[PDB]
C-alpha cells in the first residue's frame, strides 16, 4: 500500500496511480515573481460560524478532524470560486524538522507543516461525487512556521494522545476552525488535485500568503503520532508531505499585488 516510506512513498505512487504524473498534479511550487495578480478576483467568504465538528481519526496518513457536512453550516465561497463549498475535514502535512513538513513550497521555501481545509462543491451532492468533477473540491491551505504558540490549536495538540495510532478516533465536538486561520485571506490560486491517492484533479487550490505560527511544542506533539496501528512496529508519523510537482500548463493567480 501507498504511504511515505522509502518502498512506497511519492516516487513510488504512479504505479498504482497514473494520474500521479498527469496535467494538473499537486502541490506545486509557488514562485510569486511569476504569478500574476487577477483583480477579478473576490475576496474569499469564509463562514465558520455554524461549524460543527464531530471527530478526530488517525488514518495512518494523517489526522482528519471532520465535520457535519450534511447542511450549510460551515462554507467557503467567493475568491475564484463558483457556488458554495462545505467543510468535511482538515488535516495536516508536517516535517520530521522544522525546515520541512509543507506540500506547497514558496518560492522553493518549505515550511514546517501546511494545514488543509477541504471543502467539497454543493452541486454535486456529496463528497465522493465531488471528487470526480474538475470543479469538485476547494482545498484552503495555510503554511505552518515555527514561533508562538497557536492558540486555536491547542485542542488539537491535546487530544493527540488519544489518535496514537492508525484506525484510532476519538469525539471532537464544538471545535472552531476560526481559530486557525491568518489575520490575511490574502492568497494564491491554481487548478490541482489531492497530494495523496487517488490524486484525483478536482481540486481549486487557495494558498494563503500569511503563514499561522505555532510553538516548538506544538509541532513536536504532531511528531509523536504512529503510521501504524497498534500492535504493530512504531513508525513516527513524519514527513508526510508530496514533494512539489510540475506546474504544466498552468498559471497561478494572486488575489493580490
Ligand atoms: N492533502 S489533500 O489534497 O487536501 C487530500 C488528499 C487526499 C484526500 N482523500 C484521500 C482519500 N479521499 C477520499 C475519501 C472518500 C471518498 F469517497 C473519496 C476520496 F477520494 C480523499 O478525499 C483528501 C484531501
Ligand atoms: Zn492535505
Same mark, same amino acid.
Given at each position: ?18 494520474? %500521479? ?13 511569476? %504569478? ?25 496518513? %494523517? ?180 514533494? %512539489? ?13
Amino acid at each position: 500500500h501507498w504511504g511515505y516510506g522509502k518502498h512506497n512513498g511519492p516516487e513510488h505512487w504512479h504505479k498504482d496511480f497514473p494520474i %500521479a504524473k498527469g496535467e494538473r498534479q499537486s502541490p506545486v511550487d509557488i514562485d510569486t515573481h511569476t %504569478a500574476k495578480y487577477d483583480p477579478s478576483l473576490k475576496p474569499l467568504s469564509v463562514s465558520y460560524d455554524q461549524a460543527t465538528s464531530l471527530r478526530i481519526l488517525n488514518n495512518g496518513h %494523517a489526522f482528519n478532524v471532520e465535520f457535519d457536512d450534511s447542511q450549510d453550516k460551515a462554507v467557503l465561497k467567493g475568491g475564484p470560486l463558483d457556488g458554495t463549498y462545505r467543510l468535511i475535514q482538515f488535516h495536516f502535512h508536517w516535517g520530521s524538522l522544522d525546515g520541512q513538513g509543507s506540500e506547497h513550497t514558496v518560492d522553493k521555501k518549505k515550511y514546517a507543516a501546511e494545514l488543509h481545509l477541504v471543502h467539497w462543491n454543493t452541486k454535486y451532492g456529496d463528497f465522493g461525487k465531488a471528487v470526480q468533477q474538475p470543479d469538485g473540491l476547494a482545498v484552503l491551505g495555510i503554511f505552518l512556521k515555527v514561533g508562538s504558540a497557536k492558540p486555536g490549536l491547542q485542542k488539537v495538540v491535546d487530544v493527540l494522545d488519544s489518535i496514537k495510532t492508525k484506525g484510532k478516533s476519538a469525539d471532537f465536538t464544538n471545535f472552531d476552525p476560526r481559530g486557525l486561520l491568518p489575520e490575511s485571506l490574502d492568497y494564491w490560486t491554481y487548478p490541482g488535485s489531492l497530494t495523496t491517492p487517488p490524486l484525483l484533479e478536482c481540486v481549486t487550490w487557495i494558498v494563503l500568503k500569511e503563514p499561522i505560527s505555532v510553538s516548538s511544542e506544538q509541532v513536536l506533539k504532531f511528531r509523536k503520532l504512529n503510521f501504524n496501528g497498534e500492535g504493530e512496529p512504531e513508525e513516527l508519523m513524519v514527513d508526510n508531505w508530496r514533494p %512539489a510537482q510540475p506546474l504544466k500548463n498552468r498559471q497561478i493567480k494572486a488575489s493580490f499585488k
